[PDB]
Design a protein around this nucleic acid. Sequence first.
RNA 1: AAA
Length: 460
Amino acid sequence: HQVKDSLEQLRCHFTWELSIDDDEMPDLENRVLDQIEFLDTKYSVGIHNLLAYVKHLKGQNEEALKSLKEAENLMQEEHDNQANVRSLVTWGNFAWMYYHMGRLAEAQTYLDKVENICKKLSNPFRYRMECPEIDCEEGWALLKCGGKNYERAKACFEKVLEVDPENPESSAGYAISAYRLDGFKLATKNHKPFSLLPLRQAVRLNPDAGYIKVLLALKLQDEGQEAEGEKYIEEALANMSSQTYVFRYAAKFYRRKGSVDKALELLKKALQETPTSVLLHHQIGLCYKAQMIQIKEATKGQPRGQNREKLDKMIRSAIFHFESAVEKKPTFEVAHLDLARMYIEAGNHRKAEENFQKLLCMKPVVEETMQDIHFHYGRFQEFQKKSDVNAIIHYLKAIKIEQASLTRDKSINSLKKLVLRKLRRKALDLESLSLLGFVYKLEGNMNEAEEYYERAERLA
RNA sequence: AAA
Ligand SMILES: [Ca+2]
Ligand SMILES: [Ca+2]
């Protein structure tokens, strides 16, 4: 069992516990291919190694080997024919691949190659290469393989920065990881911009990287500094680096600014290059949603004639793009939620119900998203289905998720409004009395709460 | 990637 024990010491995709879920594999493969073609980075060894690992997980070991060979071929130029320690990731994946294929002599050859380099570099381990380049590669792999891996990704880059605080690559990976983790908490009460200073530093250390500039722009916009952020959007759009990714995030920036036509123009160009992107399809749907809202405002909710035909175009186009996003990534929870909400606007309550039911069964990485699922389903039940029983059930389920948030507060307020309504139709409804006490209790009005709980108990 |  020497071979397997040695393989487990290698630092490569097979030992990084990426935990790629089958339902997310088609989208991951599409995003890996997109990144190969359109992300401008100094080294591309990592992304080709991840494609090889994906092919392996798909049962295509011969195709996986082709991607490992391409990773080696490309490095001959990304370093000018010179030796680079990132090759050890490729060699580790070769050893594992050959082990799985039964080519065990070749597997041992690649173990020996890794060991030889670990010796040459005075590495303490025989097969586990300790160097910042591989810490970065581990981090980038984690950062590509879904939100559940982002704390681990951030820690990879942080490990490098604790010894080399001006390292450009780990500064970038740390900042992007931190930005996405900030995004998970963006609706929680008292959330803070932990990623802003990291993004400033990453832009300083990677002055040509448009990808990072547009994230800095968006975080500045989050923090009420839209004008400063827009300067970074313009700088990123003036350069060709990773242009198609720059378009995605610039479009988000302009949509949130209110320039929805400009956002759509950018997204339509980006979709020509990466038509499978679920982020693009979701962003396009959000643009059509925003334009739907604009039409409702200008017509005070009663569009007619051409305005109605435009509204219907917006609704049906948003549905098309949200459906496209969830076909490609069925675990994309918030796209299902936008989709359910847009079927309400189309008047199709059965399809809205259908998507809400799917959502109630999901297990989002971001647990607070279930607050929004219950809240919007509760509103659907109250207003479209005219079911106070089910509205109360789901407002309460949102409230039971204790994390303080915008939506938890809205769920408390919606429950309060519903109950106050029922009590006007029936002042001695026991259930509504105690629920109103519950609401006051959550608000901190303990005297008003107890009098309503007591009042309810007397009737009983 | 909604918020
Ligand atoms: Ca390019
Ligand atoms: Ca190729």
